[PDB]
Each structure stands twice: as C-alpha cells, then as structure tokens.
Nucleic acid binder design. Sequence first.
DNA 1: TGTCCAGTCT
DNA 2: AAGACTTGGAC
Length: 361
Amino acid sequence: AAPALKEIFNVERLQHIASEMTAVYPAFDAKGFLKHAKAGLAELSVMQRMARVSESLHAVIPLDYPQTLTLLYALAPRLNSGFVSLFLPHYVASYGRDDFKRSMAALKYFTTFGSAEFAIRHFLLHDFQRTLAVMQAWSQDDNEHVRRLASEGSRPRLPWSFRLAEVQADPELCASILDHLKADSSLYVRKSVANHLNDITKDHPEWVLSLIEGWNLENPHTAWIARHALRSLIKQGNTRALTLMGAGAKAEVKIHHLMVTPAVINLGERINLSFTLESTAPAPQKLVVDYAIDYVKSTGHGAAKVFKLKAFSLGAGAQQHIRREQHIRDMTTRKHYPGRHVVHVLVNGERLGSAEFELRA
DNA sequence: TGTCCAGTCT
DNA sequence: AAGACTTGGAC
Ligand SMILES: C[C@H](COCC(CO)(COC[C@@H](C)OC[C@@H](C)O)COC[C@@H](C)O)OC[C@@H](C)O
Ligand code: NA
C-alpha cells in the first residue's frame, strides 16, 4: 500500500517549509512554527494538515497581512509540491477577508503554483457578488490556470469543499463564465467547464440540456465538453442528452447470447458480462452501450448503478461482440451483500435484456 | 449510519 | 478519464 496522502504533510515536509521560510525571512521563528504545526500531527487528515501549516505561520510571524503576503509570494516558487502549496491560498482565505483586492491578486498569483479552488469559495460564500465579478474577469485571462480557477472555483459541487448553495440554486449566475470557456484551447480548462456543467445537471438538468442544444458541436473542443458535461444524464438514459451525442434514436438491433458468468460467485471473484448486438438497420447507427447492476444493500437494493461499456458505430447488418469483466470485491466506496444481483444491458437509453449472478453469503 | 459521487494511477 | 480513491461533503 502506498503511503496515505496525509504523509505529503509529514514532519520532513514541515521542516522543508520552515527552511524555505527562513530563506525568504531570516528572522523566521522556525522552531515556533514546527512546535505549533506538529502538535497532534498524526491525528490530522491531509486537509487538516494543509490548514495547520497556514495557521502555524500566522501564529509565529510578527508581521501584518501585506508584509506576510510579500514573504509568501517569495515562498511559492521554493516549494517542492503543488499540493503542499494549497496552504498559500488557504492563508489568504483565512486572514485576507478585509483586504479584498490584495487577496484577489494573491489568489490569482498563487493559483498557478497549485490551485486557489478551495480558498476562492470562502470569498464566494461571504462576498458572492464582489468575488463573482473577479472570477468573470479571470475567465478572460491569458493564463489557462486563471481561467480554470474561474470555472472550477465556482462549481456548485466541488469535491473537498462545501457546496455553493447560491450557485447551485441559480445557473444564470456563472453562465457567462462557462460561455466564455466553451471552446477553450486548454484541456485543463475544458475539463473544468465539463465538470461544472455536470454538477449543474444534478439540480437543473433541463437548463444544461437547453444550453448545450444552443452550442455548435462541430467545434471539437465544445463537442468534448458536451459529452463530459452530459455524462451523468447519458448514463440515466436521458433522450435529449443521447440525442446531442447522436445516439438518441431507438437502437435497430437484436441482442444475442446475453449471459453473466459464473452464475454464482464468492466475494472477490470476477463476473463476465457478454452479449452480441446485431444491426437490423440498412445504414450505420451510433450506439451508446452501457450496463447497470442492481446491487443488494444492507437493507433493500441500491438504485441501478450504471457503468460505461462502449460507444461506437454499428454497420448496417453488422454484428458486434461485447464483453466486460468486473471484479466484485469489497471496496472503500462499496460494500456488498449476498443475494441475487441483476445486470441490465442499456442501448441508447433503453434496457434490452437482463441476466443475474448470485453473490454467496 | 451506510451510501454515493468525485487528478492520479491503473 | 473509465472506476476507485489516497479523502471529503452530504444525505
Ligand atoms: C485536490 C486536487 C485533486 O487531488 C488529486 C490527488 C490525486 O492523488 C488526491 O486525490 C485523492 C482522491 C481520494 O480524491 C479524489 C479527488 C476527486 O479529490 C492529489 O494529487 C496528488 C499529487 C498532485 O500530489 O488536487 C489539487 C492540486 C493542487 O493538486
Ligand atoms: Na491514483
């Protein structure tokens, strides 16, 4: 097993931070910083450790906020880790609330060394309109890291941060940010636009569908964003979403040989889903082929869980074998329970057949 | 609770 | 990525 992520902020890293702080600030209280940062370190998760570094710096540095920021600007290029550098935007969000313009400039600078995606959300929470205006300017910045921040920091449902209830409730607030970026030349930016849009589909699917129905999907950057923005709705079999992908029509196919083997497994074994699709159409057709498992849970069953299989074009009268092995074992993100597990085959949003496997007690 | 979603490794 | 997740938010 690899070391846990929290070990990125181990004592050796804290010593590195202190040494580089001494390099930019000879009078730095490195001993006090280390004492403060190390207290209970083993009990701290990775994001607790990240925050702790910022707090420890604030506790021992006898300078004001602008003066400390000057040191931290010099510290940023000396750090040997982009993830570790998250404590720099954290310091701004913690101590910069009453020095807004300076703090915004600091986040724009620091975000290239890691990411200001967590820090900017504290400002969006406490000063939404003021911060939104800044992020609109950032969406037009020359630097792809700054444009990406504009999209990622404003996400309704960013992992490892609180949801932004104000954004989540009103997709028009950030709409112009995403519109500016819908054909961005940066893959980094495009990923963020797509993920922000996928977030929106959890609460306002029709708004995203209407938006993308207005897009020019002949632009391959925009088409790529559309496919990844709509990925949850596609798995749900949403007809408007599948239609945007060219796979909204009912599949003109027959399914043959559908099976799941073995019929009965112990936890830890693999299942094998296989079937053949035969076109019954006079021309090629675009297909989105997924599958779903109805897992047995501690009580009852979970909602059908959809996994991706294949997206492809099936020639007229052609047939295509499809096969997927899946390793069924307890995982951090899924515990399993014994009984009948039903597997459904999905083609352009339609269930075309099912099979079963038994998970033994 | 248990459950589900979500740049790097795989 | 496409899925799990070293980890975290939320229901
Ligand atoms: C915080 C982001 C993403 O983190 C990715 C890494 C990947 O292992 C940790 O994911 C752990 C996983 C359990 O979580 C899932 C994601 C969805 O949260 C950390 O990256 C390690 C290298 C960079 O040190 O990255 C911020 C940026 C400043 O790096
Ligand atoms: Na990984």
